[PDB]
Amino acid sequence: SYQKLLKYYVLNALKHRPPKAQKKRYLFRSFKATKFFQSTKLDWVEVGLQVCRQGYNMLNLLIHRKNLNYLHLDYNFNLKPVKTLTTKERKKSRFGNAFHLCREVLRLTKLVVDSHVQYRLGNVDAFQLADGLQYIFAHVGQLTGMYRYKYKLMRQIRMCKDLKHLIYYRFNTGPVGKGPGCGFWAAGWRVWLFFMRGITPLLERWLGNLLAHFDLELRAAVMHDILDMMPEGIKQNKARTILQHLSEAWRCWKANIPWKVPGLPTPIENMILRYVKAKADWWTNTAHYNRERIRRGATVDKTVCKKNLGRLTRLYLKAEQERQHNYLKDGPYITAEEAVAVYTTTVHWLESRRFSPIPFPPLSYKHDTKLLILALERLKEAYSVKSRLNQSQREELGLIEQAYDNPHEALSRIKRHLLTQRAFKEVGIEFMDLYSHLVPVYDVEPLEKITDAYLDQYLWYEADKRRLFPPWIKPADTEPPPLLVYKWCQGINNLQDVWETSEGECNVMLESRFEKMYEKIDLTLLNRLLRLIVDHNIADYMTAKNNVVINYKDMNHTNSYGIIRGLQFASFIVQYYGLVMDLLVLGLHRASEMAGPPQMPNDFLSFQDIATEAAHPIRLFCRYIDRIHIFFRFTADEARDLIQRYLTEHPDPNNENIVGYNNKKCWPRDARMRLMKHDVNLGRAVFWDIKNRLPRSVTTVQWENSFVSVYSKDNPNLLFNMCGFECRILPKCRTSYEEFTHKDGVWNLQNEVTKERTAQCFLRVDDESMQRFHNRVRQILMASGSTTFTKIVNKWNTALIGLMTYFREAVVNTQELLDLLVKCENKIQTRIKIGLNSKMPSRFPPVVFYTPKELGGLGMLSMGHVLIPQSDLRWSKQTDVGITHFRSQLIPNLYRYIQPWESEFIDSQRVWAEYALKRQEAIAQNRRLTLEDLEDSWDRGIPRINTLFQKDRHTLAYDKGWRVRTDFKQYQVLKQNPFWWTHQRHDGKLWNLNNYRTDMIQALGGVEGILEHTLFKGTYFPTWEGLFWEKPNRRFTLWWSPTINRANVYVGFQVQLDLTGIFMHGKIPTLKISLIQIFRAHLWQKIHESIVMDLCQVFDQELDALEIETVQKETIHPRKSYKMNSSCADILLFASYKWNVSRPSLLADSKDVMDSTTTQKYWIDIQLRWGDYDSHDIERYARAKFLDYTTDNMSIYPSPTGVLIAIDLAYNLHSAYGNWFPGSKPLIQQAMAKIMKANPALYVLRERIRKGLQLY
């Protein structure tokens, strides 16, 4: 309180503004000047009473001036409605916050004045008056409730509380004990006076009132200016014609067309052009602003957002047309000598490799059918099983299935297209809206699609056969990117004395992008390069394929510079151009050293001899599709020579090199790169050296998109970003000096020769990857709209599975990603809740979300700490013995059910060595490896062992370059692929969550426990095992209704359903319509009538033996069936004798004591109910209703002795608590058994609810 008071004191003293100069004008002098006011001198209390009454009268006049009389404003200024308030009436009584603020201010005034009146009358004392005033001015939020009508009032309320705390703890010292005896009201009184200084103008304005298409606008203004400069006579002819010309100009600008109207006058055309330019500028600004808002996270409808994207498409399309124009004007940006240099480099490399050029596919290739089948299968992957197949969509499937029908004619057609087809059709393009960046996607004609797919398969197979691509080129088919990172880290750690810096040696790890790789590939130079490794006809085909017009909606251009990047063989083209770039970067000598001699080529990261390894600074090299990762090791001399060369080319006198250095900001400061002068200069030097080797016209490496991390005697950490992983290698001998346990994100690197832990590789998730996932979830929520809850949860589960199976240990190490995951999970749950009900609930049971889909729930995979409350694992099951209650805890998380990448890799290596041993011992046995063997290695091996037993394994063995093909699939298919890195067919299945589902069901409380919160017990199905669903949000909310409409989750409720016994805790309109339909045609009243009739028939059949005179059908009011608040009598028994009745006991109370009394008449009452999850206990309900109605005044019962049978229709439960005479208890038990075996109306209700639930 002290500190908070000081805060506002300092803010007042600091935000203080000079009092503005003005002219003295006084309100009250003006009032006295007029003849309407007069002056006197009164006691303060009298004036307080007058002001109270005047405010009361003015509020009443405001209320009554609209001639309404259904709200009552009492003297203490409580505005209570007269009666239950109607929706139309709930629109006239909308006064505003100002009205209630003024009413509560008058309530405060009334409290003060009435306190003074109490003092004056002699009711209280002066000390009591002062204490009351301080209490009023301190406890104002608990006496008025003003803060609801203005939130800023919490500042004043908290300030008054702070003053209370500051004053009391000095007042209550020594003999003065703690209690209500302080009356120092001079502080709160001041606080509540400075509030009235500010709101007085506001409330007077309110009482003063109560009492006595920007682009379209700009176009309209331009047209109005034209009309102002226009003759009056021609206004119905040219005004529309001029507007039509302006619209045509806007359409042409959107399509990048040269709109021109020769008939239009030159000044008119100039004005139209100015208007078009203004509209284009406004459109560009608005599109950029909306794109930035969407990327930041602003929410908008999918249609307007799609309009914004399509606007951005046109801007990019115009920019690409312009780029093609500049290339057509500036010619080949690459120089002729640069061209011949790169061409000589590649020919030297390929003759060094003794490469055999890929020939044109002969007619009778051994595998041509196989590759065609693979291409058709890959095309079919795009077409998932769906009903949305347009003319072109179904044409593509017709064509690929025809190719399946007759492979030979298809192969002949492909070969003909290769040999002859040089001109093609326009390629359509759209864009995936990754909120970080827009990715183009290209739509190619289906015949051309098949041709390109077959060419891609054929060329990749041949290149894999001929070893065109050295091992450093990635991604490879044998290894997923997560294993790429692990092998890179191990290769770094296994270099010769890589972590030694005593002499001063420095390691440098560089990563870059090959900026604008796809765009800056000259097609003529591309053709020349392709002509060496492939037949000239095939090269001509693929190069002509990228010289093709691209269209979108209306705007189209031809592509002469860039590569289409959506073609099926674009993968091969990019991977070959990248190889040529690697020849440029490494140089022929070092490239040969890494690749190894042609007959015995090296693996990913290995050399023939360690001397070959240490023969150059460049130890490791690994190019992704366009990324490059180079690892240098320099001696002191080499590093200083490179630094000297760089500084000679780019002198740095003032040490300005420390300003533009990219760092990994996600790591702690001590774990980042330490920007010492020597290390910074070395990194800049090595980057400049690498950049110089690449001619700027072919491709560029930009510093601000690169990251060069130097490990030396100053920087003990080596950092790099590879394939979305954020890795930091820290050697054990270097700054570790600490025993380490097993941490999930940390990889224990060890030397392959001595098996000693020399380093640790800490793992993290890329900021780019986290942002991509967050944008995916944002797309899921924003593009939800009218979709079913099941579809939203399916998309969320797909996203979470992709992220958690790609970044296995990294997500565990990355705390920010854990927080983002929990936030997104809560956002998904909140959107589901809002769809369920507009009001945000409290403590929504998670059993609704996490229940498996087959079990009726949504099946949300969990990545957060959710504590299932112990009250949610309670269920009851009723049999003839009675109702039995049982109980069953943290919800399991995904990351426990996915094996870590490191364990997966070591297990894969061990299991595949085991498989090699078993395979050799078996072809020694001359048999085939069976299922019985390798069964202990079933779900093991990164190439899953299961892939050895597939049917297409021979066919899949001819599918080369499938991983890069999958990576390029995002460039052709309109669906984002979370599993762009792996293939189910080749790598198998890398994760298993069946155990997760089982532990899920166990955690929610078992099948029964899940079903308790459902309406299953209403279906009266004897078991759950034999049921099935019919593949829904209405069915979903109705299914989970008993646990959603409970009083706990929604409070301030229980509006009764009409002609129905159902309480709806909260306005749940979907549940409301379901319940209206499920209780149509007075179903509740029919239930009550039929059960009463059944009991009457049973009791007539058992009249004499129970010593009964007769049975009387007591007059039941038509609304008595749904009358909860009170009750009446349903069945009346006359004994003709005096029965001996017992103390009121439950139906199952086999042990009952006599009431020691007698009676003649016995009333039987039935109370029907719709029990929710919390209050489905029929026994408690029956006992409470029986003991309440008997002792009630509005429930008239003929005799004090009787029974009240309560039937829970929701859970098919029953219990009777009333008195029992001889034979009444077992007969009533038999009666309820028979009634729930065969009651026509109860059966009708059960069948109806089964229909509504769609559960059979």
Partner: peptide, 27 residues
């Protein structure tokens, strides 16, 4: 005890990533 999802931060002390991960048997 609300149904809101809590962050795993600081709640992984007693669990590893690999525990409770099982392997299936051939069909």
């Amino acid at each position: 005890p609300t149904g809101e999802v809590l962050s795993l931060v600081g709640k992984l002390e007693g669990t590893r990533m690999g525990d409770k991960a099982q392997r299936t048997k051939p069909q």
